[PDB]
RNA sequence: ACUGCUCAGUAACACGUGGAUAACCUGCCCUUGGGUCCGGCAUAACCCCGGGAAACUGGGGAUAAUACCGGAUAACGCACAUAUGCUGGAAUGCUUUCUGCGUAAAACGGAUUCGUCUGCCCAAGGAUGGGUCUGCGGCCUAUCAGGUAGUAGUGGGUGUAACGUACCUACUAGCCGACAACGGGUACGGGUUGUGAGAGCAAGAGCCCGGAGAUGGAUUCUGAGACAUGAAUCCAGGCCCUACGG
């Protein structure tokens, strides 16, 4: 659980005095980070019967060659780097926009594993 | 002083027994799922598996919970809880599978049968 | 007591006749059974079949509004008309 | 899902008498703004049943049909140009918007008559289908001849196409809002004025003016193809 | 995106690889179009813009000019200057206070 | 989770009003396009024995469904090529799509006059409900002058129904204010009401619209939807039934 309601001052620093409680629709879940392990997923429910698939661990990827446009599933070994956080590279976290290392070759994750339910990585040219 | 309830699966017949003394002390410590010799019941080779219990104040034992004492449980379903509303959680008082001197009733079932009849081996 | 009838629309969706008339009574406002007995002869409707919903008398002048109705079946009346109307309308031999 | 006596919609001609709620219309296919309950229609306009229970009885017994569909619910919405058919008297009525934006009923002559609809968004269902954002009846998932706002006409109750009433310059047009509601007249110029809100249209019937493209109905080639105006019975 | 039609406010002579750039990016600009001047452009991709108008007071029957500040998105291809008249149109929320992106920044004359 | 009540909090996109959502969810309802495929077999009341001051509630025996589980034909996300389909400044969407890579549903249920009626799944859209969004409109105060560091913004992310510092990271050094920020005072907002010849001035208890609240407070289950007025959980606070174990 996290609160994603509109609570960060107004424009100036005058502390916004809340007139409403923490509503149910403003409650966001936890960042279920993904690592390189046994491929584990959970069918967490969301609004309107939309069970969003959340991934937690994975050592395989759907590496997509751009030269020929062929999709083959190759194992994930290590995150090469990541622009979003300099610590996920050390933690082997698999976020979107990171760069993983597969058997096919180095690839960049182009899918959000916490929302997509799979690790779809485009093979870097 | 245990007020044991024993049921027969072959006829769906439950015999209520009032037991005391050394046999009651033998029943103490026997967790849920234990098998007990019929000499504690006097039955000719009838072995009973204990599958329940409750306190003097009506608190029901739980086979799930390990430990003899009481615990507070915020459950949403299971043994000894009925949801008044659909998917409602409550904090009841349950017991472990361990048998205690503050336990009255011991529900159990007949498993390993004996030579004689079940009824006639208790004077009936 | 006198009666003149103006509107006799028949509802095709229920097979009943809507009786609208002006009650030219004198003095004492007639009861529902009496107005039914008078309104029966105007359109050939039995007491069990002819039904009246109000004989509402206005101020001053002795004129009343009569919203009576006619059915081709008493079971249809019991299925459609409310129970207070069935009690309020005395059947032949009713108590 | 309630609505009160005071906050009854502007398109609802029925007054502000009674006690709070007046017959909450369902979600339905049509907009709730231009909608009246079938129970309110049969209890106020036509006057075939006076109570709500008797209205629910007559609806439930398959006695009233809305484009050949005998709806048993008294909360069904009704949109503009909707036909109500009663076979027992041959009473045909059409939902119409008068000059004040309110919804009324005009009686028709024949029981069997078409119904007019409109195109609002042509999307593509997977399977090579040009979905027209239909909401009522059956239709034809057609081709690019069927454009937006084309105002299709379809039969009843089978709801097959009768004639593609495509609009052009000079063709007929009926207003569906504003202060010009019900002033049907020929189209003068349908200008595709680019802007962030929506485009515009030029229409002149008895008197010329400018009107919005969401307040125009392509109701005929030169003359009324559908039975637009019959008898305005309350 | 970069599309030329009547009253287009056409895409500039400079290409921008911005994600929120209306002509070259993928941000659909839509809403209410407005006009203003850059109060200051000391902030990345965001020019504070002032709207100046007047509200006639009913009782006194006179006027009072009212200032107002708006934060707009300043794409690099446009690059709205300092104190220049510019037309802004609404977009989806870019940031904490950014729902407008500038589309035409004309240096004043 | 609709009504119903209250009017504490709230000086606020809370509200009135004009737009937007091409940034989103929607059970019931709506029309068209499809489908409705194999199974598995618990556990209820009931039977036999109770425990319990109560609140509650145990065991063994029998069993059913539109209950629940397992299996086949989609959606979801990556990468592609393919023709205006809407809207149109405007794709970013639908997409003809197909490609391969991970990746799914239903109750051939019920009734009948066997005419049919009503239900399950599914795709597209609508409608309904609600979140979000911003131009503008409306208090007293200087015996209230600086306020703000997640504060202002950029890139990459994260979570979300969805856009978003909503959270996180690297970075920039901004942002609001003397045309009143920040603080204090006060207040449910508006439609309106009082009064006067009017300009105005004063209040916005009741009828309708939206907002919030459930002893004060935090947290959570269930559900299409709630942090639920007749849901829970604990703390504070008061009270209450007890066979004193609750
Ligand atoms: Mg949920
Ligand atoms: Mg924001
Ligand atoms: Zn650009």
d(CA D88, CA C15): 10
d(CA E88, CA E63): 26
Minimal Cα distance from D61: which residue of C?
C13
β partners of residue A98:
A82
Q: Locate all alpha helices (DSSP H) within chain C, ordered by sequence.
A: 32-43, 74-80, 83-88
Burial label for D106, CB within 10 Å (0-12, 13-18, 19+), is middle
3-state DSSP assignment of residue D105: strand
Q: Which of D33, D30, D26 is nearest to D7 (CA)?
A: D33
d(CA A48, CA E84): 48
d(CA A29, CA A2): 6
* Ligand 3 centroid from CA E18, angstroms: 7
Task: Give the determination technique.
Answer: cryo-EM
- Give just the sign of the alpha carbon dihedral E77, E83, E87, E88: positive
Q: Which of E35, E17, E38 is nearest to E26 (CA)?
A: E17
Question: What per-residue string of b and e applies to B6-18 under the rule 16 or more CB within 10 Å gives b?
Answer: bbeeeeeeeeeee
β partners of residue D232:
D106
Structure tokens at B61: 């034992």
* D196/E5 touch (CB, cutoff 8 Å), yes or no: no
CB contact set of A63 (below 8 Å; sequence gap of 6+): A71, A72, A73, A74, A102, A104, A105, A107, A121, A122, A123
Q: Which of B38, B28, B31 is nearest to B64 (CA)?
A: B31
Q: How far is the CA of C36 from the C1' of F12 (A)?
A: 68
| Residues, CB within 5 angstroms of ligand 2 (ion) | E 93
β partners of residue C67:
C20
d(CA C77, CA C86): 8
Q: Are C5 and C17 in contact (CB under 8 A)?
A: no
Q: Are E97 and E74 in contact (CB under 8 A)?
A: no
Minimal Cα distance from C15: which residue of D?
D88
CA of D198: nearest nucleotide by C1' is F88
CA of E15 to nearest chain D CA: how many angstroms apart?
A: 24
Q: E-chain residues within 8 Å CB-CB of D200? A: none
3-state DSSP assignment of residue D75: coil
Q: Are D53 and D40 in contact (CB under 8 A)?
A: no
DSSP classification of residue C86: H
- Give just the sign of the alpha carbon dihedral A115, A116, A117, A121: negative
DSSP letter for each residue of B24-89:
HHHHTT--TT-EE-TTTTT-TT-EEEE---BBTTSPBB-SSS-SSSEEEEEESSSTT---SSTT--
CA of C89 to nearest chain D CA: how many angstroms apart?
A: 19
DSSP classification of residue C29: P
Q: Are E36 and E80 in contact (CB under 8 A)?
A: no
* Ligand 1 centroid from CA A51, angstroms: 9
Radius of gyration of chain C (CA): 13
Q: Locate all alpha helices (DSSP H) within D76-145, ordered by sequence.
A: none
Structure tokens at D203: 């229409």
DSSP letter for each residue of E3-28:
---TT-----SS----SS-TTTSS--
d(CA D79, CA E52): 45
Phi, psi angle pair for B21, to nearest 5°: 70, -135
Q: How far is the CA of D158 from the C1' of F212 (A)?
A: 51
CA of D29: nearest nucleotide by C1' is F30
Report the DSSP pairing between strands B70-75 and B47-50. unpaired
d(CA B74, CA B108): 26
* D194/E32 touch (CB, cutoff 8 Å), yes or no: no
Q: Are A29 and A1 in contact (CB under 8 A)?
A: yes
DSSP letter for each residue of D185-218:
EEEEE------SS--EEEEESSSEEEEEGGGEE-
d(CA E34, CA E49): 10
Q: Are B109 and B51 in contact (CB under 8 A)?
A: yes
DSSP classification of residue C72: S
| Total residues found in chain D within this entry | 234
CA of A13: nearest nucleotide by C1' is F148
Q: D-chain residues within 8 Å CB-CB of C80? A: 54, 57
Tell me the HSE value of D227 on the side-chain side, using a 13 A CA sphere.
Answer: 21
| Distances, alpha carbon B80 to alpha carbons A1, B75, C26, in Å | 30, 10, 77
Structure tokens at D108: 């028709």
CB contact set of B29 (below 8 Å; sequence gap of 6+): B98, B99
Report the DSSP pairing between strands E98-106 and E85-95. antiparallel
Q: Which of A80, A92, A83, A85 is nearest to A36 (CA)?
A: A92
Q: How far is the CA of B73 from the C1' of F220 (A)?
A: 15
Q: Which ligand is nearest to the CA of A8?
A: 2
Q: How distant is the alpha carbon of residue A99 from its chain centre?
A: 13
CA of E6 to nearest chain D CA: how many angstroms apart?
A: 7
Select the residue from D71, D72, D88 to test the C interface by mutation, using most C Cβ atoms within 10 A.
D88
Structure tokens at D221: 């080639």
Structure tokens at A68: 């020929």
Structure tokens at E5: 């039609």
Measured from the Cβ of residue B74, the count of other Cβ atoms closer than 10 Å reads: 8
Is D198 near chain E, with CB under 8 Å? no
Q: Which of C95, C91, C85, C15 is nearest to C52 (CA)?
A: C85
Measured from the Cβ of residue D223, the count of other Cβ atoms closer than 10 Å reads: 8
Select the residue from D196, D198, D199, D200 to test the E interface by mutation, using most E Cβ atoms within 10 A.
D196
d(CA B96, CA B103): 11
Q: Contacts from E104-109 at CB under 8 Å and sequence distance 24+?
A: E104/E9, E104/E78, E105/E38, E105/E74, E105/E78, E105/E79, E105/E80, E105/E81, E107/E81, E108/E37, E108/E83, E108/E84
* D57/C11 touch (CB, cutoff 8 Å), yes or no: no
Documented resolution in Å: 2.9
Q: Are A82 and A97 in contact (CB under 8 A)?
A: yes
d(CA B124, CA B81): 36
d(CA C25, CA B74): 77
DSSP letter for each residue of E42-91:
-STTEEEEE--EE--BTTTTB--EE--EEEEE--TTT---SS-EEEEEEE
Query: Chain F: nucleotides under 7 Å from a protein CB?
Result: 2-4, 9-14, 18-23, 25-33, 47-62, 75-80, 85-97, 99-103, 118, 123-138, 146-170, 172-179, 181-183, 191, 199-201, 207-209, 211-214, 218-228, 231-234, 245-246
Specify the residue for token string 């484009």: D67
* Residue A77 host element (H or E): strand A71-82
* Residue A55 host element (H or E): strand A52-57
Phi, psi angle pair for E79, to nearest 5°: 60, 70
Minimal Cα distance from D91: which residue of C?
C12
Q: Which ligand is nearest to the CA of A10?
A: 2
Phi, psi angle pair for D40, to nearest 5°: -65, -35
Specify the residue for token string 């109307």: C85
Is E7 near chain D, with CB under 8 Å? yes
Burial label for D32, CB within 10 Å (0-12, 13-18, 19+), is middle
């Amino acid at each position: 659980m996290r609160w994603q309601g509109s609570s960060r001052r107004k424009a100036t620093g005058g502390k916004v005095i809340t007139a409403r409680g923490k509503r149910k629709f403003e409650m966001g879940r936890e960042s279920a980070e993904t690592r390189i392990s046994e491929i584990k997923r959970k069918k967490v429910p969301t609004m309107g019967g939309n069970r969003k698939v959340r991934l937690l661990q994975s050592n395989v990827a759907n590496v997509t060659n751009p030269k020929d446009g062929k999709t083959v599933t190759a194992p994930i070994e290590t995150v090469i780097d990541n622009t979003a956080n300099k610590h996920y590279v050390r933690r082997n976290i698999l976020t979107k926009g990171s760069v993983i290392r597969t058997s096919m070759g180095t690839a960049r994750v182009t899918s959000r594993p916490g929302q997509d339910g799979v690790v779809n990585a485009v093979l870097i040219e | 002083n245990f007020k044991v309830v024993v049921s027969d699966p072959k006829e769906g017949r439950a015999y209520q027994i009032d037991i005391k003394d050394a046999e009651a002390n033998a029943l103490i410590g026997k967790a849920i799922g234990d098998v007990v010799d019929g000499a504690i019941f006097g039955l000719a080779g009838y072995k009973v598996q204990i599958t329940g219990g409750c306190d003097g104040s009506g608190f029901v034992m739980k086979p799930d919970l390990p430990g003899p004492r009481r615990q507070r449980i915020l459950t949403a379903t299971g043994v000894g809880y009925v949801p008044k509303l659909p998917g409602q959680r409550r904090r009841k008082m349950m017991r472990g599978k361990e048998i205690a001197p503050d336990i009255i009733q011991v529900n159990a079932k007949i498993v390993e049968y004996g030579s004689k009849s079940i009824k006639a081996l208790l004077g009936l | 007591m006198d009666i003149k009838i103006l509107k006799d629309k028949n509802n095709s969706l229920l097979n009943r006749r809507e009786l609208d008339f002006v009650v030219k009574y004198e003095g004492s406002t007639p009861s529902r059974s009496d107005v039914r007995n008078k309104l029966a002869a105007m359109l050939n409707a039995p007491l069990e079949l002819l039904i009246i919903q109000r004989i509402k008398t206005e101020y001053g002048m002795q004129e009343s509004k009569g919203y009576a109705k006619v059915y081709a079946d008493e079971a249809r009346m019991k299925q459609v008309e409310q129970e207070y109307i069935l009690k309020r309308n005395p059947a032949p031999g009713a108590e | 899902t309630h609505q009160k006596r005071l906050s009854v919609p502007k398109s609802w001609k029925v007054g502000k008498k009674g006690n709070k709620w007046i017959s909450t219309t369902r979600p339905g296919p049509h907009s709730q703004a231009r909608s009246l309950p079938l129970g309110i229609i049969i209890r106020d306009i036509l006057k075939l049943v006076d109570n709500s229970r008797e209205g629910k009885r007559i609806l439930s017994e398959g006695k009233v049909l809305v484009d050949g569909i005998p709806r048993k619910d008294l909360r069904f919405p009704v949109g503009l140009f909707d036909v109500i058919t009663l076979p027992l008297v041959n009473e045909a009525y059409r939902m119409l918007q008068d000059e004040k934006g309110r919804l009324t009923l005009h009686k028709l002559n024949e029981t069997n008559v078409n119904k007019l609809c409109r195109i609002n968004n042509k999307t593509t269902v997977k399977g090579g289908k040009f979905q027209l954002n239909l909401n009522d009846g059956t239709n034809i998932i057609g081709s690019n001849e069927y454009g937006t706002k084309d105002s299709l006409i379809l039969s009843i109750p089978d709801k097959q196409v009768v004639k593609h009433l495509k609009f052009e310059v000079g063709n007929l047009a009926m207003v569906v809002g504003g202060q010009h509601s019900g002033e049907t007249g020929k189209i003068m110029e349908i200008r595709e004025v680019k802007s962030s809100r929506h485009n515009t249209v030029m229409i002149s019937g008895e008197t010329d003016f400018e009107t919005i493209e969401d307040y125009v109905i392509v109701i005929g080639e030169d003359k009324p193809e559908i039975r637009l105006g019959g008898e305005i019975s309350e | 995106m970069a599309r030329d039609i009547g009253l287009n406010i056409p895409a500039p002579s400079e290409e921008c690889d911005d994600a929120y750039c209306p002509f070259h990016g993928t941000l659909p600009v839509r809403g209410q179009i407005l006009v203003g001047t850059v109060v200051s452009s000391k902030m990345d991709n965001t020019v504070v813009i002032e709207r100046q108008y007047m509200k006639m007071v009913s009782k006194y029957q006179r006027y009072e000019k009212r200032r107002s500040k708006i934060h707009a998105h300043n794409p690099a291809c446009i690059s709205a200057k300092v104190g220049d008249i510019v037309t802004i149109a609404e977009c989806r929320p870019i940031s904490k206070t950014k729902s407008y992106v500038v589309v035409k920044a004309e240096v004043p004359k």
